[PDB]
Amino acid sequence: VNTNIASLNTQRNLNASSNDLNTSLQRLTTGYRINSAKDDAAGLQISNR
């Protein structure tokens, strides 16, 4: 097994964890669990109203 390595699941999990980390960092630096972004559009409408 040398033309490729099956460890690319690690890259997949790393990308997923990095996106989750950016979301958590944004939520922390903004203080809003429901960010002004797309997340929880229903809660977004409730917050807007």
Partner: protein
């Protein structure tokens, strides 16, 4: 200016933000669909 505006503008902004948040919810849908499809896509490419 005097009478109508004070309330007509509310009549505007209510449905205005309603439509804006409708578009924001459509964007939320397409982006969540994008996250799901890109995760599926990485997984199926890795299995392939």
């Amino acid at each position: 200016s005097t009478a109508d505006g004070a309330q007509n503008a509310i009549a505007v902004v209510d449905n205005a933000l309603a439509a804006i948040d409708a578009q924001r919810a459509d964007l939320a849908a397409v982006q969540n669909r994008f996250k799901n499809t890109i995760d599926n896509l990485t997984n199926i490419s890795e299995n392939a």
